Write a protein that binds this ligand. Structure first.
Ligand code: NA
Ligand code: NA
Lengths: 989, 989
């Protein structure tokens, strides 16, 4: 019979396995003197919900448009109220039946009218730098062709179609296409024409493509230069000029430059160059560097490098995949300001303007092809496009466009085939194509662990233990002896590690110590630089970030997209502050006697001449001595002992016992760089003279007994509970043991291995740790000193339905001024629940005070938070912050803000100050309870309740990285145990 | 030092392991002519949150009461706004550290002033029939003693304390005590004085206790009678008179009554009797019956009985544990009206007034002691009071009070030691005590499967398969050969089975067929008679039932307390309607040729003389023939073939082919009984002449094609989707395949055994079955007949992220009057998800119509819902219900309301009727979507949205009983498969 369905042709094109049609050959993105017109601006836009109903109403001509409205281009259209962003991690948001598309498939019709002056004749092209995911392009109603590879560029010849004067450009964009099955990156799905649209004249006798080859001979110091130039695919006559090197050579000929200063991320030397034909001139920045693998090490200019990396997606919280150039420049400077020297373009080529900035600012870049088929994994990889010969041409096209665009950039030191795309014949074909086209850059691909088609062995989230075995070259053999031998000779990179989601990441120091120890380890790229929060505004006026499921998604992955070192506005998370310190390129170990410091230069190429070395001694009152010490430049990978001025050690010699003082030595930029100002701190080291343990008060005040209350100096207790009700007039609503905290993103992750794979959060809920109850066993007053008394309150803490508990005894003493509180914790019964041992989050006290706190001051580590396996960036000192600044604005609220290693704290509660001292404790202060924090899914759910929740922890567990990869390392776990700890409390007006 | 804690003495008493102090010896509850004053009424009540702050302000004297307000007694105080009800199933709501109590422990001080006239002197007592959980009792300020065993009675001698005229009775009640650790029944925690408080005079020369022994010799027909009577524990001179039997005998002497009519649940013959001393007369109802175990069968009066049982808790949705007498009488009549002959008093003795009613109405009662320590099980039973010698006296006291109170009742045929209290020495001591005190009733206790200390082997929720092996006596041996031999010689009872929570229970017929087949099987007691809903009223005016967690509980078990055959107001759930039919005591199998019926009398004692046998033939128009047929009485366990009048078979002979007609034969009560009126239906059977398969319309209308719509007779289709948009003017908003339903309580239960223990609900969510998407493959018009056409719409249904799907083809045809719809379903790919095969809930269609439905009519099974493993009570006929009456008011909304076995349906949508016909289908109609139904936690969450959701299922899965015990039996499971089915649709005005 007769077919009656609508849209069949549009759908058949969307279901194509081929690369797009009609485009010019892939080439470099080049700075040319050829005339150009950017078509970016306000376009006209109409959205249809699917191909079947998308109108065929001749809209391409731009006459009498029915249902179009203004939209900026470039754009990701769901950022501008057209549908909604949708987030999945692995799962596809559509039925998995390639190459077919869902019926619900946003179709966005875009139209711009522009003027073409005489300079665009007779030859010109239209360039599109990215369209997600399938574009069909018409110019004055004439089909140019189609685009596939959402993050890749396409150019269309418009000679003889483009007209003098007015022209109408129309682009139909489908969100979903067969291409969406190979674009399954863990990020928002965001259709749109989201990168530049450019008219470019193509003058006769021009230059279409250029391939710079600029090697460095590290023995002789020569540059090895050849600049290819072609037109229409053929090598052409052109002149290359490099004025700084006193060179003029023909394009196409290799020459030896007697002396070049080589390019590295540390020293990003670039020589300005031009390659000219009669009709066109191309401007280039040439960095001379050669990359080799030698002795299972990845070497640049003859040296093994350490990659201090991050994975950079392109995201903006208001504009989606469109990242303004000011934001790109600012975030790169921010990375350099945090000691980052390497970037993986996870998992697609970046905006083409990225590459010049990386060459300039200095980063080793793993430039990754736009390919990911991760959602095929849950079906055993059945139908995976990576191994389906019908997709070979589409996947080789993606690799070809990736490589041709960026091949001239010194910053690019590896090509990556894609990410989490399984193994298969089309990956092998992409690698073959790349090795043949550009043998000058090693190939990377983590998805095939046998490493058959790559030149480095790459893994994601391998544990510190497996990374140590790999660094020693003693990881288990592959089955194939030939592949085993090849992989053993490769250097090893963590392309994603220390997942930075929420409170964390824990365990960074342990990987970094291995990276320093084993030359085969190249380093690692943190996952990930940024959180992909999307700003959501509420009717009152407050912004917060939204995450997966905040936009009506049927299927999504919640806050797994907010897993970065910075928020979407590039504000640092504590993890970035810690990472900067972990990867610092100099090591400064300050002598205990303050006579000097050991300085290790951990850079690969630069000496220490860029740095000014500063010292300062700080005490209670402020700075006591400081200055700058002159250091003869130290070679990369060498170290020296720098003497400090004698006045410094004399100051340390003369300090009274138990007066606290901190000597800090810092390496700062001696002069402005391209990425920071003079004075910018790169590295530091300290030596601390610790305050003496507080003297517990003499127990000279006796206990005053009333019918319902007991008084001991400035403490009033409920006689019914044994718990304080005020301390020097500050109301105490509650005091009790804590063992739990509001789970972090990591604690919500599965604990892989062994019989128990409940996330720690679930282990804790099952155990009742979040719902502890206290039974009073007794209250005794005992003899102290000179008629004074101590008061001991004996309690047992447990939870409904559990037989295990802890005995907690509080002993209060006071001389009328300060209050001594000794806490003793003893395990009672076996802490096992559901067949598994229970772990604690902490051993601590929670004081709920009945007044708000405005300010929190402390001597300890800071200014930012620190847990046992984090806080590397938190240094010793005296800190003071408004209460709200103690918090951490994670998108999903969770345990955060603890300051470990506190020696003393002071809370300002209006006119009164509550001072806490003792052996080291962790300090946290909040205006809402742990139950409020745990329940909150977004920051607007946190409401101050007029109280202060003060946490003083004798022990804390680490935070690890269990949301993705290793949980808390063995040394930072917290098994139930007996504990004893003393505090002093003093309320001052 | 000096102790300073408060409340230590009250707490030490609450933590006592002893039974209460000061009470008179346990005895029978007896109807005496001794004067009595009920103190029930408005008392004065003050609540303190714990012992430490409960005032010692001399309130016992009732003078100048500070902070008391009026409260009815008996009461469960949290039903009257004093704190809140709290529900846990197994878990204790307090830390498990017996005998200690939590600090938060509601203390309720109760006070009543009353007058004692001269008739209460010189001797009297105060009787308390239940206090939860610990009472301390003062009279005029003088301590009487304490109560333990919340559901047991205590009496205190008040001689010389009670005063002529005004007296003040004070009772301090603690919710929690050491006793709460042995009162862990799955029900609400509800402190209070929740049973009668009675002053009773004790005249000199009276009767304190009586023990009736009334056996029956089934061979001779003699009664064996001995009535013991004692005072102060000593046997006394008393006269027993039984006027109906022409007897006067001395108390204490056993006599042989030559002829007695024996008591059974079927024939509850009771002889009025009195036992008299000079000072007191006690009124008794004597049922003669003897109980024995013989040949591994439980026999009463020489016959094996079948128990058709339920577990009865005491609950009222507004008064808590106080069940008004009118409610008790009405619910027992309701049980008898549903063929129930047996009751287990789960898990404590009932109100003492229960027992006379069970004797009278006729039920075999398992009278269970107030003991349950289930929350010790999760710690391996460590510290279980059942095996701790410190608790022996408290537990033997509980068994002694249980047995002494009820020992005179013929209805009591087993004593049960308690429930889910593990194994141990104190259970053995309770059993020893009981066997010695009353060897006339077998002992029951399920918790020790070795059955060492009991006389019947009892299990809860054993599968139909294990029950079959037990019925054949071939279950696996115990390790001990001596215990094995004893247990093999016991008859077997399911003390809980076919858990009745939500939609269900499924699988009842299969247990009942075993009960009939194997004499060793005693029958079973459904869990449970009632839902324990608590009425919650909202500010507008609407009531709904609340469940666990609706009352602010920190820990609770949600809707596991709403798991009954009736709701808390005793309104039947569909499961009761089904159970009545499953346990019907007569079997009526109607001959296919309508000449007669086979009648089996499945009663144990009664013949069929109580019943009138009625027949009726019903067709389309109504009744065609009917009457009453005389049946000579059939003996218990015999059967006969009853001929129907010849006019009936002649009517069947003459019916036109495929005209539907139903012959129903019913056994109804011929006369009013104590529990129902004449005409009450006890049993039925049918024979159906099935309507002929509908003639599909001739496909004579062609397809009309427009740009955006196709028309085929009265059907309009979207041309873009292929789906109908109206049928004869009724708007169709949506039509598509269904495979899922909103999970029942059972589907939320774990699927025990094998590698997969996800509840089915979780299996379905994981599989994406609740979020199906449909892709259109094509639409063709094909040649029908005489220029008409059929329209085939080909689609594929699957879910985001899944590779499996089903191909669904719709073929529409019409002659302009009726519409033929053929649906073809074919599996595409392997339906496995997370390593396990996916199961479907159904194979069906959902029509979302854009108008409301007022009425639903059908020919099929009803009136109530039916699924493949339920609906036994739904008979063949013609039904018609207002839309809201199609629904089932489960407390947690869930899949329900499907009418399986429908042959035709008619929906009234204002002025139009939509008629559906075909091969048998299940029919459901709702005013809200499945997503709304699934999300709803309570009935007020269901909101009509102005649409009709119509479900027509070609297949359904069973509902089973997986919330507790067996899931869906193999024969009712639904594995993905190909299907084909035809419907006809007709819209009439
Ligand atoms: Na992520
Ligand atoms: Na229950």
């Amino acid at each position: 019979g007769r077919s009656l369905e609508l849209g069949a042709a549009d759908i058949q094109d969307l279901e194509s396995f081929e690369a797009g049609r009609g485009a010019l050959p892939a080439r470099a993105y080049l700075q040319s003197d050829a005339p150009r017109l950017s078509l970016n601006g306000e376009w006209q836009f109409r959205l249809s919900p699917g191909s079947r109903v998308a109108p065929d109403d001749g809209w391409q001509l731009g006459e009498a448009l029915n249902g179009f409205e203004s939209l900026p281009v470039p754009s990701s259209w769901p950022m501008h109220g057209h549908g909604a962003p949708a987030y999945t991690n692995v799962q596809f948001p559509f039925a998995v039946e390639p190459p077919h598309v869902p019926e619900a498939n946003p179709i966005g019709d875009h139209l711009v009218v522009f003027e073409a002056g005489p300079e665009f004749f007779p030859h010109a092209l239209l360039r599109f730098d990215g369209i997600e995911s399938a574009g069909t392009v018409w110019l004055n109603g004439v089909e140019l062709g189609t685009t596939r590879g959402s993050r890749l560029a396409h150019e269309f010849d418009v000679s003889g179609i483009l007209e003098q004067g007015e022209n109408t450009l129309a682009v139909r964009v489908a969100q979903f296409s067969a291409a969406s099955y190979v674009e399954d990156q863990d990020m928002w799905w965001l259709p749109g024409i989201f990168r530049d649209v450019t008219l470019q004249a193509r003058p006769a006798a021009g230059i279409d493509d250029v391939f710079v080859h600029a090697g460095y001979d590290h023995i002789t110091g020569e540059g090895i230069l050849k600049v290819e130039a072609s037109r229409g695919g053929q090598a052409i006559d052109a002149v290359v000029r490099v004025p700084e090197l006193a060179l003029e050579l023909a394009a196409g000929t290799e020459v030896r430059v007697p002396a070049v200063e080589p390019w590295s991320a540390e020293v990003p030397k670039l020589y300005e160059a031009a390659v000219s034909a009669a009709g066109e001139s191309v401007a280039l920045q040439i960095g001379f560097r050669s990359i080799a693998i030698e002795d299972a090490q990845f070497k640049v200019n003859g040296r093994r490098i350490l990659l201090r990396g991050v994975n950079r997606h392109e995201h903006h919280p208001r504009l989606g995949r469109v990242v303004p150039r000011d934001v790109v420049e600012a975030e790169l400077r921010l990375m350099k300001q945090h000691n980052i020297n390497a970037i993986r373009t996870s998992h697609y080529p970046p905006h083409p303007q990225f590459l010049a900035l990386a060459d300039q600012l200095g980063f080793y870049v793993v430039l990754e092809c736009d390919l990911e088929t991760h959602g095929f994994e849950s079906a055993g990889w059945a139908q995976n496009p990576s191994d389906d010969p019908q997709w070979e041409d589409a996947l080789v096209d993606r690799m070809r466009r990736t490589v041709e665009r960026d091949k001239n950039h010194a910053s690019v030191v590896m090509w990556s085939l894609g990410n989490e795309a399984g193994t298969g014949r089309n990956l092998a074909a992409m690698s073959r194509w790349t090795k043949d086209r550009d043998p000058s850059r090693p190939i990377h691909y983590e998805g095939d662990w046998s490493s058959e088609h790559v030149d480095v062995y790459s893994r994601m989230y391998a544990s510190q233990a497996e990374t140590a075995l790999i660094g020693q070259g003693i990881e288990p053999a592959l089955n194939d002896a030939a592949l085993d031998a090849r992989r053993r000779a490769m250097p090893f990179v963590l392309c994603e590690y220390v997942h930075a989601m929420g409170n964390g990441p824990g365990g960074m120091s342990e990987y970094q110590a291995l990276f320093e120890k084993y030359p085969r380890l190249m380093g690692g790229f943190v996952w990930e630089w940024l959180e992909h929060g999307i700003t959501v505004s509420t009717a009152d006026g407050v912004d917060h970030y939204g995450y997966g499921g905040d936009f009506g998604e049927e299927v999504h992955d919640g806050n797994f997209v907010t897993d970065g070192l910075v928020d979407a506005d590039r504000r640092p998370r504590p993890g970035l502050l810690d990472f900067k310190k972990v990867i610092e390129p100099l090591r400064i170990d300050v002598a205990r006697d303050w006579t000097g410091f050991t300085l290790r230069n951990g850079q690969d190429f630069a000496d220490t001449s860029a740095f000014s070395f500063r010292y300062e001694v700080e005490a209670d009152g402020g700075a006591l001595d400081g200055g700058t010490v002159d250091v003869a430049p130290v070679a990369p990978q060498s170290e020296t002992v720098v003497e400090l001025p004698g006045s410094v050690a004399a100051l340390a010699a003369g300090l009274s016992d138990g007066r606290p003082a901190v000597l800090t030595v810092r390496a700062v930029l001696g002069a402005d760089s391209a990425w920071a100002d003079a004075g910018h701190e790169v590295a530091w080291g300290q030596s601390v003279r610790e305050p003496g343990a507080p003297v517990p008060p003499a127990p000279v005040e006796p206990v005053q007994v009333q019918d319902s209350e007991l008084t001991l100096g400035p403490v009033v207790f409920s006689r019914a509970t044994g718990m304080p009700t005020s301390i020097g007039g500050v109301p105490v609503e509650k005091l009790g043991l804590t063992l739990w905290w509001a789970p972090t993103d990591n604690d919500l992750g599965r604990e892989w291995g062994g019989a128990d794979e409940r996330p720690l959060a679930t282990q804790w809920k099952d155990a009742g740790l979040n719902r502890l109850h206290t039974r009073l066993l007794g209250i005794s007053a005992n003899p102290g000193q000179d008629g004074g008394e101590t008061l001991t309150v004996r309690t047992r803490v447990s939870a409904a339905d559990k037989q295990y508990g802890v005995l907690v005894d509080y002993t209060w003493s006071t001389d009328g001024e300060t209050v001594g509180l000794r806490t003793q914790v003893r395990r009672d019964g076996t802490w096992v629940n559901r067949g598994f041992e229970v772990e604690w989050a902490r051993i601590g006290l929670e004081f709920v005070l009945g007044e708000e706190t405005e300010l929190v001051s402390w001597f300890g580590q800071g200014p930012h938070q620190s847990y046992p396996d984090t806080g590397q960036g938190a240094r010793a000192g005296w800190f003071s912050l408004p209460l709200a600044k103690m918090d951490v604005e994670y998108v999903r609220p969770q345990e955060c803000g603890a300051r470990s290693g506190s020696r003393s704290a002071a809370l300002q509660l209006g006119g009164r100050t509550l001072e806490i001292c003792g052996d080291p404790f962790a300090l946290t202060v909040r205006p809402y309870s742990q139950d409020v924090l745990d329940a909150a899914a977004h920051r607007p759910d946190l409401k101050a309740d007029g109280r202060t929740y003060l946490y003083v922890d004798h022990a804390l567990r680490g935070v690890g990285t269990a949301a993705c990869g290793p949980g808390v390392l063995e040394q930072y776990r917290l098994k139930p145990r007996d504990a004893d700890f003393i505090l002093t409390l003093k309320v001052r007006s």
